[PDB]
Amino acid sequence: PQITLWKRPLVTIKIGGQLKEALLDTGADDTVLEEMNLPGRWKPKMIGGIGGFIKVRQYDQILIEICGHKAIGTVLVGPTPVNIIGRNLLTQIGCTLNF
Amino acid sequence: PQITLWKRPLVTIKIGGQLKEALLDTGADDTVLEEMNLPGRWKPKMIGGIGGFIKVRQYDQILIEICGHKAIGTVLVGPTPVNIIGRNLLTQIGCTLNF
Ligand SMILES: CC(C)C(NC(=O)[C@H](C)NC(=O)OCc1ccccc1)C(=O)N[C@@H](Cc1ccccc1)[C@@H](O)[C@H](O)[C@H](Cc1ccccc1)NC(=O)[C@@H](NC(=O)[C@H](C)NC(=O)OCc1ccccc1)C(C)C
Numbered sequence: 423p424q425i426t427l428w429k430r431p432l433v434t435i436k437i438g439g440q441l442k443e444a445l446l447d448t449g450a451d452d453t454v455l456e457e458m459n460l461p462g463r464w465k466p467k468m469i470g471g472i473g474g475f476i477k478v479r480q481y482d483q484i485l486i487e488i489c490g491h492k493a494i495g496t497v498l499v500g501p502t503p504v505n506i507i508g509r510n511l512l513t514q515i516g517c518t519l520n521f
Numbered sequence: 522p523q524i525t526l527w528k529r530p531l532v533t534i535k536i537g538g539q540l541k542e543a544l545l546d547t548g549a550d551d552t553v554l555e556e557m558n559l560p561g562r563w564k565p566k567m568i569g570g571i572g573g574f575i576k577v578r579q580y581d582q583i584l585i586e587i588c589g590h591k592a593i594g595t596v597l598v599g600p601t602p603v604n605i606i607g608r609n610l611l612t613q614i615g616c617t618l619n620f
């Protein structure tokens with residue numbers, strides 16, 4: 423699709439059989455989910471943002487379907503009020519910015 | 522312009538007759554720039570991101586050009602690590618996501 427930005431660009435995603443929604447976020451290097459139970463052991467990892475820095479949980483090789491497009495990569499579990507799809511997955515679905 | 526997302530979607534902007542660089546950020550509701558003097562009155566405002574909240578100065582009706590597209594709107598100024606163009610100005614330049 424072609425998504426305008428008058429509201430937040432939330433899209434439906436599918437991850438481990440569950441439907442969730444998430445934000446297509448060109449300002450995120452990484453993909454970050456709030457709760458999602460991803461299976462097994464995770465690596466600790468730091469990320470930053472406008473407020474400063476926070477510890478999150480890194481899981482690798484995670485399959486998310488985004489609007490029907492399959493993407494496999496790293497997914498962080500962290501304190502975000504919304505699920506965030508970052509550039510690491512946006513690139514794999516062929517997502518571009520256009521004006 | 523079509524912009525891919527294998528690296529950060531950084532672009533040249535002009536604001537108060539200065540060239541700067543700033544991140545096209547579809548996950549930001551608002552536009553936040555590094556401290557600079559802008560014309561007219563500001564009001565205090567707080568905004569939230571990763572690692573918490575920061576205090577910014579809000580200016581209204583600021584002219585900004587993004588790759589030669591004029592936009593006029595609200596620009597927040599404060600201790601951001603990166604200049605951010607959010608949805609409030611991305612819609613004005615006709616910026617869309619496409620996959
Ligand atoms: C999600 C993060 C991984 C993302 N960070 C990155 O990609 C960073 C730079 N990469 C990174 O950490 O790489 C690893 C590394 C290791 C450490 C040192 C350096 C590098 C991020 O904070 N990116 C943001 C832009 C950014 C880029 C670089 C530096 C600083 C800011 C927005 O795209 C992204 O959309 C966030 C998502 C966000 C929303 C809400 C709170 C938590 C996360 N929006 C924002 O930070 C802004 N918020 C908003 O647009 C509206 C106002 N806020 C909001 O609704 O807040 C609600 C609220 C706040 C607090 C708690 C509860 C809810 C802001 C730019 C205006």
Ligand SMILES: O=C(O)c1ccc2c(CN3CCOCC3)c[nH]c2c1
Nearest residue numbers: 564565566567575576577578579599
């Ligand atoms: O530039 C400043 O001197 C300045 C000083 C104070 C604030 C505040 C205080 N607030 C406003 C919103 O509610 C909570 C706290 C925000 N920006 C600010 C900027």
